[PDB]
Structure 1
Amino acid sequence: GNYNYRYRLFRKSNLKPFERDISTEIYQAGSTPCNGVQGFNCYFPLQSYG
């Protein structure tokens, strides 16, 4: 496995053309806040390719 290449899997809105997103904030996919901790309905935005 080469997990050094990552792609952003979760975002609130689509990107404008020629825009980059280097943020690492936890994507809240539920009603409960995440507080920067992964868990139930709180996911890391970047996933490795493998």
Structure 2
Amino acid sequence: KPFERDISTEIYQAGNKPCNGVAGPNCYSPLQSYGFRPTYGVGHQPYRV
């Protein structure tokens, strides 16, 4: 919903079986990392908004 903050990392249960709080098959951590390097092209460079 508009203007909402979520910070809790629960292992995504896309599969039909509970993840039990660990990573594995059909169990991925929701958070993913940008990697910023000077040689990256415009459009992948980090932008401050």
**TM-score, structure 2 length as denominator?**
0.67
- Could you list the structure 1 runs, at least 4 aligned residues long, displaced by more than 3 angstroms after superposition: none
Aligned residues: 35
**For structure 1, which runs of at least 5 residues remain unmatched after alignment?**
1-15
- For the aligned residue pairs, the C-alpha RMSD in angstroms reads 0.6
Report the structure, 1 or 2, having the larger strand content. 1
Higher RCO structure, 1 or 2 (CA under 8 Å, sep 6+): 1
**For structure 2, which runs of at least 5 residues remain unmatched after alignment?**
36-49
**TM-score, structure 1 length as denominator?**
0.66
Sequence identity percentage: 86
